RNA sequence: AGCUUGACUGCGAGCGUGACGGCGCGAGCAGGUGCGAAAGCAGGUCAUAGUGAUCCGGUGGUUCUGAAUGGAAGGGCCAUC
RNA sequence: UUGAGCUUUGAUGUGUAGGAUAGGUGGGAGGAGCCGACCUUGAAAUACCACCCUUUAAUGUUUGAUGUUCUAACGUUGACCCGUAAUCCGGGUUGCGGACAGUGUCUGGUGGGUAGUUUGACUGGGGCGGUC
RNA sequence: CCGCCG
């Protein structure tokens, strides 16, 4: 049992109400003469996370979650699921397609992508700031006329599509970022 | 149930069986319309002698009257010439009161209720086929020619 | 908290038990202590149970 | 025929008891050589729920001996200590050159917290695709590997997951003492019922048939 | 009122006990329904406001058996 | 560093300390062990924090009771949650 | 007309690569014939058969899910007739609905519409902050 | 497809 009151928690203190885990992003605690205290809390949903805004009173608030965000190593894929390993304790961990969501592209292998595990099971996977990948379906981009940034699109090894310049063809292994999805440079 | 059949019911009985029916089919229909009796320790004794010989035939010879109530008007063709419209589109539709009165006034004295209507209330002048049910299996084909006048 | 509590059950005919604690997620091999059984009045081996 | 009499002694209307056809497993088959027994055990698992996986280590009593070649990933004194524990290639990333060559000479990968940095980093796919890793769930990686492999070379038969209900384990050679095998099938029950995924469905063990290799059928009961 | 003609079922009372054992006076009502019963001797319909178990009684007893019991209790039907 | 399970069961004179519930110390006694050649020490840890009363209920044991009697259920006791 | 289930008789899983016309894995040298593993392999390598996924059809299927037809319960705040000097009620016919609606019991939901209530103490007044 | 100005 770990009960919390709304005048206590600062930021990142993961709470659990209405069947879903919530991260608190920030909370402003106000209380005015001749009123009671309330904390206009800017939360974050954790499973389907867009954002949520709750304005709690001074009492009450929610239980916490078993919510460990430790470093996991992506090492394996099979059917749907994606297996992970700790480089500190070497415990198993199995992620799902609802937990991988919109990031099934960005891992390649041996990546130190962090996950958030909730109540002894992962629901989210965060791939790193950059991954290096290979282009397998890209047109042999010719200049032709083009005076003014040519920018050809490249389909990648992981089934991603990125916009690359006209000097990378196929087997030109290139690194991208995962937070946006842009080409940054080429690994050699 | 305890249903002894006074009559031929068209999907369960053979004029004196002990069919186990739903109770609502016994209260509302089979008991008041002469098709059944409850058999609770007396009516099995009341069917044993006096009904399988006498009252198994008092409906059977009135069903052999259903063979003979049909051929009273053996002509079986009817000319009704009531008020009509103009090139079709009949004035007033002939209902079961006027179809029976076209038969009661000349021929069979059957009532309103045993007149069937396979094709509505006859909104049309023409030759039409009107069924006169007298028995559950014996169906007539008395022709009502709706005529314009 | 982490160090959960187990139940050493006697390997004699009876059901006397000692209860104690063991951190399972550091040393997960079972306890095979040799304790006194007051029903048998002997000193038989005990073994971990829940 | 030769495969027709095999079908003739299978009565699916009766569920057979414990002692009945286990003594008849040499009669239910027409094998040319000496064969073994299998055991089918079914454990209710939803295929889209990863909270219901059952893996572990089943130390097994009594019969078959050292017949499983076991790989070592240890350091320190344990690079020469479990050499007294009977394993063949004791070591390190020498066995990582053999992962890169794809060799089938071992069945088990056992390591230590010294060697927990090798197969978790180098042999990543090829250790769990065919499944041969270790952590804090199976009994694979302690640091007491000397007295670990004094028995796990002998009788351990690895209770492993399947996507559906099935957990098929292995019975021993037919010519042992077969009454003890009815405990070797029974002293897997108390370990499968020892700890599950705390999220079981309706039944624990629905259907159980101990086949020999290809011909025997004996309907086991989950209760008795 | 809400009284069965045949069996004399009038609305009894009782508590509406909740999960926290909060008592609250409710009122159980009988499953009444005005049915239009066929009498073979009278050859007509008698409209009675029977309960649903009052129709069970006329399923066993006669309709004329039950109407004679109403006549003994001063019932106009 | 070796061997090890005394982090043992039944008691416990005598005090210490609390309004009380309670808490603490304890030579010795019986049974059974460990270590040591032995004298001896050992009923957890250098000491002092690491914790919650009852009620209700859960599991194991014990025929102690068991609503005519025979069982059982449910209580009780003991170990515990 | 149908929808998912079982004992059940069996057919049925077609690409990477291995000659291809590989369901999964635990066993893994068996059936005038001829495979198989060994080897070529992939992310997993096949015979033999097991427990079964995933399709197909037969039956006893447990059945529900709806969807027309009918009239006799039921409804009618539709017309007419009678009680009757009565835009109530009752009966009698007829029409239209029709096993729906409605009601009783049990039941999940919603429910400040309404009711009973709770909302700690110390505090150099009390609140706040702190503390137990 | 892209191509701003001295």
UniProtKB/Swiss-Prot annotation, chain A:
User: InterPro entries of this UniProt entry?
Assistant: Elong-fact-P_C, NA-bd_OB-fold, Rib_uL2_dom2, Transl_elong_fac_P/YeiP, Transl_elong_KOW-like, Transl_elong_P/YeiP_cen, Transl_elong_P/YeiP_CS, Transl_elongation_fac_P
What is known to happen upon mutating residue 31 to A? No lysylation
- Offer a single GO CC term for the protein: cytosol
What is the reported phenotype of gene knockout? Disruption of this gene leads to lethality or to a very slow growth phenotype. Required for the expression of poly-Pro-containing proteins.
Task: Please indicate if the UniProt record lists Cytoplasm as a keyword.
Answer: yes
Q: In which pathway does it act?
A: Protein biosynthesis; polypeptide chain elongation
Q: Which sequence positions carry the modification called N6-(3,6-diaminohexanoyl)-5-hydroxylysine?
A: 34
Kindly provide the PTM information from the record.
Answer: Is beta-lysylated on the epsilon-amino group of Lys-34 by the combined action of EpmA and EpmB, and then hydroxylated on the C5 position of the same residue by EpmC. Lysylation is critical for the stimulatory effect of EF-P on peptide-bond formation. The lysylation moiety would extend toward the peptidyltransferase center and stabilize the terminal 3-CCA end of the tRNA. The hydroxylation of the C5 position on Lys-34 would allow additional potential stabilizing hydrogen-bond interactions with the P-tRNA.
What molecular function does GO assign, one term? ribosome binding
Keywords attached to this Swiss-Prot or TrEMBL record, sorted alphabetically, are:
Cytoplasm, Elongation factor, Hydroxylation, Protein biosynthesis
Tell me if Transmembrane helix is a UniProt keyword of this record. Answer: no
Belongs to which family? Belongs to the elongation factor P family.
What is the protein name for this chain? Elongation factor P
Native source organism of the sequence: Escherichia coli (strain K12)
Gene symbol here is efp
UniProtKB/Swiss-Prot annotation, chain C:
Q: Which SUPFAM superfamilies match?
A: Zn-binding ribosomal proteins (SSF57829)
Give any GO molecular function from the UniProt entry: structural constituent of ribosome
Keyword RNA-binding listed: yes
**Keyword terms, alphabetized:** Methylation, Ribonucleoprotein, Ribosomal protein, RNA-binding, tRNA-binding
Query: Which PROSITE patterns does UniProt cross-reference here?
Result: RIBOSOMAL_L33
Q: Does the keyword Amino-acid biosynthesis apply?
A: no
Which Pfam family would be a valid example here? Ribosomal_L33
Output the GO biological process annotations, alphabetical, semicolon-separated: cytoplasmic translation; response to antibiotic; ribosomal large subunit assembly
The GO cellular component terms are: cytoplasm; cytosol; cytosolic large ribosomal subunit
Q: Which domain of life is it from?
A: Bacteria
Name the HAMAP family for this protein: Ribosomal_bL33
- Which protein family is it in? Belongs to the bacterial ribosomal protein bL33 family.
Q: How does it assemble?
A: Part of the 50S ribosomal subunit. Cross-links to the P and E site tRNAs.
Per its UniProt record, what PANTHER family does this chain match?
Answer: 54S RIBOSOMAL PROTEIN L39, MITOCHONDRIAL, LARGE RIBOSOMAL SUBUNIT PROTEIN BL33M
As a miscellaneous remark, the entry gives: Surface exposed on the 50S subunit.
**UniProt protein name:** Large ribosomal subunit protein bL33
Species assigned in the record: Escherichia coli (strain K12)
* Gene field: rpmG
UniProtKB/Swiss-Prot annotation, chain D:
Q: Which residues carry this modification: N6-succinyllysine?
A: 100, 149, 181, 192
Gene Ontology CC terms, in alphabetical order? cytoplasm; cytosol; cytosolic large ribosomal subunit
GO biological process, any: ribosomal large subunit assembly
Intrachain disulfide bonds:
none
Which Pfam family, an example, fits this chain? Ribosomal_L1
Q: Which UniProt keywords apply?
A: Repressor, Ribonucleoprotein, Ribosomal protein, RNA-binding, rRNA-binding, Translation regulation, tRNA-binding
Q: Which InterPro entries match?
A: Ribosom_uL1_bac-type (IPR005878), Ribosomal_uL1 (IPR002143), Ribosomal_uL1-like (IPR023674), Ribosomal_uL1/biogenesis (IPR028364), Ribosomal_uL1_3-a/b-sand (IPR016095), Ribosomal_uL1_CS (IPR023673)
Against PROSITE patterns, the record matches this protein to: RIBOSOMAL_L1
- Any GO molecular function: structural constituent of ribosome
Q: Which family does it belong to?
A: Belongs to the universal ribosomal protein uL1 family.
Q: How does it assemble?
A: Part of the 50S ribosomal subunit. Cross-links to the P and E site tRNAs.
> What is the annotated role of this protein in its UniProt record?
One of the primary rRNA binding proteins, it binds very close to the 3'-end of the 23S rRNA. Forms part of the L1 stalk. It is often not seen in high-resolution crystal structures, but can be seen in cryo_EM and 3D reconstruction models. These indicate that the distal end of the stalk moves by approximately 20 angstroms. This stalk movement is thought to be coupled to movement of deacylated tRNA into and out of the E site, and thus to participate in tRNA translocation. Contacts the P and E site tRNAs.
Q: What is this protein called?
A: Large ribosomal subunit protein uL1
Give the gene name: rplA
From Swiss-Prot, chain E:
UniProtKB keywords: Ribonucleoprotein, Ribosomal protein, RNA-binding, rRNA-binding
Q: Which gene encodes it?
A: rpmB
UniProt cross-references to InterPro entries, sorted A to Z: Ribosomal_bL28 (IPR026569), Ribosomal_bL28/bL31-like_sf (IPR034704), Ribosomal_bL28_bact-type (IPR001383), Ribosomal_bL28_sf (IPR037147)
Stated name of the protein: Large ribosomal subunit protein bL28
Family membership noted in the UniProt record:
Belongs to the bacterial ribosomal protein bL28 family.
Q: Which PANTHER family match?
A: 39S RIBOSOMAL PROTEIN L28, MITOCHONDRIAL, LARGE RIBOSOMAL SUBUNIT PROTEIN BL28M
Q: Name one GO cellular component term.
A: cytoplasm
What does the subunit section of this Swiss-Prot or TrEMBL entry state? Part of the 50S ribosomal subunit.
| One GO molecular-function entry | structural constituent of ribosome
On the tree of life, the source organism's domain of life is Bacteria
Q: Which GO terms describe its biological process?
A: cytoplasmic translation; ribosomal large subunit assembly
